[PDB]
User: Fold Chalcone synthase 1 from Oryza sativa subsp. indica.
Amino acid sequence: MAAAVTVEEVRRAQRAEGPATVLAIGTATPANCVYQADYPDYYFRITKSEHMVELKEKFKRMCDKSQIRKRYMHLTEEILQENPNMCAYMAPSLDARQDIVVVEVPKLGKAAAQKAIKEWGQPRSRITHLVFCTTSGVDMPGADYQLAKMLGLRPNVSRLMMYQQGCFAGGTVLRVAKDLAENNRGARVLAVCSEITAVTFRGPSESHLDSMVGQALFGDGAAAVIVGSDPDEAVERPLFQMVSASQTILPDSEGAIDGHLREVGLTFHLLKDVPGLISKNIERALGDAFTPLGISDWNSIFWVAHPGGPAILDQVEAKVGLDKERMRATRHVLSEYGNMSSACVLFILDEMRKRSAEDGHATTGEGMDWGVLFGFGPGLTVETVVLHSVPIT
Amino acid sequence: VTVEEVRRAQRAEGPATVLAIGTATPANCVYQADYPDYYFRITKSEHMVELKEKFKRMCDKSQIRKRYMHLTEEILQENPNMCAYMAPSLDARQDIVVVEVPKLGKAAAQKAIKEWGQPRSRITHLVFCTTSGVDMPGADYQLAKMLGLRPNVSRLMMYQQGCFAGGTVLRVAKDLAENNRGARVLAVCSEITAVTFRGPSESHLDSMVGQALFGDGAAAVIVGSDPDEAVERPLFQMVSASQTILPDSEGAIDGHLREVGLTFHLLKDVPGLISKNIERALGDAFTPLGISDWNSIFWVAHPGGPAILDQVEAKVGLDKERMRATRHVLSEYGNMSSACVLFILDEMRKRSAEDGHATTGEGMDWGVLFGFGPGLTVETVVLHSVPIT
Assistant:
């Protein structure tokens, strides 16, 4: 005869069996859109810096070299006219910025989440976990609470709020979702990244070109994924499996990317050769992830890389010796959306599956079986997620 | 190699287990009996006589004996804007806490690691939680660097969560440890009230409540599945971890990070809301385990204020002994936000051993840990004790 319920019995019945699987991806952007070709004129106009001719020249080259075609931005000329301190380089403006992003970040998240949930096709009540990630603003209760309420999720959905994370955190949310889905039978994780540049937007200064780099690259967007183990093939449609997820700090990278939340909003600093650091270390990250899987040809896997800037992509591609095709999905998202911080790699994942289907590839990973997703950010931190594709009909 | 093969080898086998607990506080200590005089003196507020009387009653009722505070009179003199009720001071506050939060976390982590007795290189994950300040890279990066952890430690940085997050960090550590063979998770909560300290104002008393209750502290645990029971010494097992939002609690506890620092706003009856809903939380957690007698389990509850504890006790009908460890920590440390429940777990296993009880949970096999915070959010962690050996 059995004894009372034991912790061992609970654990056995509680855990899921298979790998965490991406079951849906939805994305959303602000409606307002600005062509990169027009951005130097627009930016220097609305920040009233047109007299800074040599600086505008520098900014022109930064935009021209960004390999970005357009970005979406919640911030409009009208909003900026109501917030003149945001147009200065460093004027007190955190409250004004918070007032915007504490509302707009979960609102944009809702739009991406609704699309993911519609694709998924299951009731909202079946969502067991919500992971929300942003680098734009902070509040209590957080954007996770706001989104859960907006979506009408169950009150006992398990939430994790990831604040002030930075550009590597698309990798981080997948790494978190992986453990949540795999360790909990029936778990269906809604994971959302939502980024709004109103917290970082600021005017130009001659003494801080690295800050102007941010003004050339950063754009707005949100992406949502549904992640679960043990998909029900009768009603769910797997897109990618997660296999492993790791995070590391690169040697000799202290202070390479710093960000501080101050009374003037979120400031961005660059101190080292970020593309050089990443490309110098990327092969060891690849080996660490793939040697245990018996994989060594980096041209034989599909690629999702955080497009921090075009230089990162160029130098990784050259260092590793990737065929030009490998970075196409990544570069597409950089071109059409710019650098949306944590949400980028999720947009690229979406692009990857969609083009794979449209182009009649054999798998959701451009015909390949294994793939890698990289997040890059403050640390210098590298998130590495090994993916496996799924066959397409 | 197939993905199914990888997964079977990758995952751990048993329940996430707390293997060590370490705690630390700033050196500077203030007796609650002295605090109204002190607070009204340094904030130059002596003329607000009726208000000081109200604050005196708040501290009298707090059931706090003393608190530790990084903030000193000397630091406050250098930051006069922090002593106003509302003056621009976020930068000053950030300058302090971005440094002090991971520093205090380091002290607690070193003690946990010493107790654990394994090399630092065996730590695979670091979860860091604070409600005091934000930065990039975060306090998690700073702590990893300060401790000399492996560069590829998997970090999770939990910012701005508030008082329920001691529950949250355990909920996170649980899934990390259980889903990853060999994983050993360092989880740290570190809270420093420099971010919320401000002068008194007769127009907002809920802000003065915070000045009466909040104190500084950090706690660290090592969590792992499949312990080596010869060299690793289990203290508590986690069994389930849940989170919920109480009905009709919208706006009960709000906190905003502004140019004047972190402000807090109470809008509903928090002890009433919690006590009204706590039996349902107990039920949701324990019914699947065949457990219904709330006096037959050990208790760890976030001591948000004495009224929460009193009203939960009265509603549930708890023997007064059940809240002893919780009230001890509130008495000796005040409300240290997320770190509190970890201090209380430490208190419970220590007193259990001193009293000669049969388990780390005051002689009982099962227990519950509650975090309470903005939402109104309740974290519920079901624990199992370990026989004292």
About this structure: Residues 12 and 182 of chain B are 7 Å apart (CA to CA).
